Amino acid sequence: TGTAPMYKVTPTTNLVLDGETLATIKAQDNQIGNNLSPNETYPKKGLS
Amino acid sequence: FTGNITTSYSHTTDNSTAVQDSNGESWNTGLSINKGESAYINANVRYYN
C-alpha cells in the first residue's frame, strides 16, 4: 500500500494462540516474493 | 458260624467329547518418557532500546 515496489519480499510473522506466540517465522526461498508493486499482492489477485 | 469269599472283576470303557468357545477383550495404556530430553521450552521475549 506504499509508493514504491519491493524486491525480494521477506516478511517476518508471529503466530499467536490465546496469548502465547507459537512461532516467529521468517520467509525463506519458498516464501519470498520476487516483485511486489504498489497496490498489488503476492500472489496476484487470481492466484491462491 | 458263617463265612464267605468273593472275587470280582470289572472292566469299564468310556468315550467323551467336549466343545469350548471363548471370547475376550483387552485394553492397554502406556506412557514413556526420556530423562535426557524431557521437555522443550519457548520464551516470549521483546527487545528494548
Cell of A37: 508493486
> Nearest-CA distance from B35 to chain A in Å?
25
**CB of A21 within 8 Å of any CB in chain B?**
yes
A12 in Cβ contact with A26 (< 8 Å): yes
Grid-cell match 472283576, residue found: B9
Say whether residue B13 is in contact with chain A using an 8 A CB cutoff: no
- Grid cell 515496489 is found at A5
> In which residue are the cell numbers 503466530 written?
A15
Q: How was this structure determined?
A: cryo-EM
User: Which residue, chain included where needed, has cell 516467529?
Assistant: A24
At A40, the amino acid letter reads E
